[PDB]
């Protein structure tokens, strides 16, 4: 006595992996194929709806790194390629009498350089950091890029300041937000709400420490694929920000030259003041409180009788063994040795920092970029809102780990899931067609 009735527009959905749209209200992150955001974004809370979320299998991380890398490459391609700079360098020390930690860090290198006229050559002198220039045998050196890849000169007019990017669902699809405090990135979420488009996510590039990310208001959240599998990283979302002040105190000169028809090379000049090393100022009391919260959450996950130890990274390249970040186009690497140095059994820290002018972003080998120099003294202030930890039987030792930007992006995309709408469905009713 029942018949099928067909309903179109039924609020049912399935897990889906589809392409998302860019939305954003020169900068390297500026996207032309990107739409202005909604002035009044809509969010609809789903009452009495519990749904399983999984950040580890979220398909938006793959889109995030694919879009960031493609955008980066597209922005870098229409710029000067430094083909005549992979030449032999004859170098000496810039300031041989320094006794500071910058002793030997900056070298003054001479080379013969092609000019606009093919017939003419011009000897050029410039300064480089010890991490970009490597000894061949004054002394002779070469640029490290010559070992593996060609250098593109990034356009000086392009800014690297992260711009929050919104990822919007295509029509027929929706994004669900867990919006559940103390959610550990996996399993049922009872607070799911529907959003057409996410909030902005900045393309912040860092390792070991998560900068300018979302804060977990209720408590520090420890997330892992398998909390007892030492091959995976532990993503820690803090419930308090830690302010960090990083700077390149030297007042550096910037010079520029023409190297070919319409092509120009920009380079580090002399130093206009006392040579000082780049460093970061981290408040000790705030870090101490942060450590306390992380330690109590780690004890909750691994047992309240376990001794916890933080130590420096045991190996890898500079991008893995040290913290890295971008400030205004300058790329800083900092030891962090004073942050992960403690054992728990139960006023201001200065971190030395190094500058690398030539970098290899996103673990890519065979491609490299030469950043332009920036004038004067640079200082930047940011918030540390999360940590990366990796675990090594009485004492569990943790190290920064890191080295994979997809974890840094997953640490922000964990709250969102993409689903496809299934507007058709059937149900029994007491209804017959004529």
């Amino acid at each position: 006595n029942l018949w099928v009735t067909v309903y179109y527009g039924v609020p049912v959905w399935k897990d889906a992996e589809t392409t998302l749209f860019c939305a954003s209200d020169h900068n390297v992150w500026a996207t032309h194929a990107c739409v202005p955001t909604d002035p009044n974004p809509q969010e609809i809370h789903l009452e009495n709806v519990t749904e399983e979320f999984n950040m580890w299998k979220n398909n938006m991380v793959e889109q995030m790194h694919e879009d960031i890398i493609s955008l980066w490459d597209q922005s870098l391609k229409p710029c000067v390629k430094l083909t005549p700079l992979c030449v032999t360098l004859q170098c000496t020390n810039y300031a041989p009498k320094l006794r500071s930690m910058m002793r030997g860090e900056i070298k003054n290198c001479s080379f013969n350089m092609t000019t606009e006229l093919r017939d003419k050559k011009q000897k050029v002198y410039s300064l480089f950091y010890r991490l970009d220039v490597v000894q061949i045998n004054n002394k002779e050196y070469r640029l490290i890029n010559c070992n593996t890849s060609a250098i593109t000169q990034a356009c000086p007019k392009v800014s690297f300041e992260p711009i929050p990017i919104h990822y919007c669902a295509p029509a027929g699809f929706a994004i669900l937000k867990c919006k559940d405090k103390k959610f550990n990135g996996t399993g049922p979420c009872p607070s799911v709400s529907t959003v057409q488009c996410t909030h902005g996510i900045k393309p912040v590039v860092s390792t070991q420490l998560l900068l300018n990310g979302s804060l977990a208001e209720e408590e520090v959240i420890i997330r892992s694929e398998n909390i007892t599998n030492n091959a995976k990283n532990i993503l820690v979302q803090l419930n308090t920000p830690v302010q960090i002040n990083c700077t390149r105190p030297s007042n550096n000169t910037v010079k520029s030259i023409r190297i070919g028809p319409g092509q120009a090379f920009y380079y580090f000049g002399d130093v206009l003041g006392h040579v000082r090393m780049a460093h970061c100022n981290i408040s000790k009391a705030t870090w101490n409180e942060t450590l306390g919260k992380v330690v109590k959450q780690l004890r909750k996950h691994f047992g309240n009788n376990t001794i916890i130890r933080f130590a420096q990274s045991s190996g890898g390249d500079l991008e893995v063994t040290t913290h890295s970040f971008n400030c205004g186009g300058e790329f800083f690497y900092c030891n962090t040795s004073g942050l992960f140095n403690s054992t728990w059994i139960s006023d201001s820290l200065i971190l030395p920092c190094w500058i690398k002018q030539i970098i290899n972003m996103w673990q890519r080998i065979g491609q490299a970029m030469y950043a332009p120099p920036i004038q004067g003294v640079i200082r930047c202030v940011s918030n540390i809102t999360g940590l990366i930890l990796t675990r090594d039987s009485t004492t569990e030792t943790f190290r920064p780990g890191g080295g994979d930007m997809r974890d840094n992006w997953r640490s922000e995309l964990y709250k969102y899931k993409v689903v496809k709408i299934e507007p058709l469905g059937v149900a029994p009713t007491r209804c017959k067609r004529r």
């Binding site: 029942l2 018949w3 059937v426 067609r433």
Partner: protein, 119 residues
């Protein structure tokens, strides 16, 4: 609101179909995504067409309910279940129902043609 009734009972949720219907339609991959959304919309509209429901959100047919697919009473289905739970409970039968609906519409169209043929 869009999917606002997702956690509501099936009966109450049947009154919000308009919102989802309007929300199904709202750089090479962006164009591809729009084309795929269009293809899915058109597949659903064609599927309603073959069922004789191209112009309606809710349409009744002549196909009986098997009762083996689900033996719940109408009160339990419409008041004590969500659409997600219902969709899960008949996930193994949906294509059978679709086939029966297509056969029913074919029989209705042929019978209608024969009735119209009478003077």
């Amino acid at each position: 609101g869009f999917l606002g009734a997702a956690g509501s009972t099936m009966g109450a949720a049947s009154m919000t179909l308009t919102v989802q219907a309007r929300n199904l339609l709202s750089g090479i991959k962006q164009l591809q995504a729009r084309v795929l959304a269009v293809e899915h919309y058109l597949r659903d509209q064609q599927l309603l067409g073959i069922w004789g429901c191209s112009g309606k959100l809710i349409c009744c047919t002549n196909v009986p309910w098997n009762s083996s697919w689900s033996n719940r009473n109408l009160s339990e289905i419409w008041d004590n279940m969500t659409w997600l739970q219902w969709d899960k409970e008949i996930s193994n039968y949906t294509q059978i129902i679709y086939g029966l609906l297509e056969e029913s519409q074919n029989q209705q169209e042929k019978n209608e043609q024969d009735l119209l043929a009478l003077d």
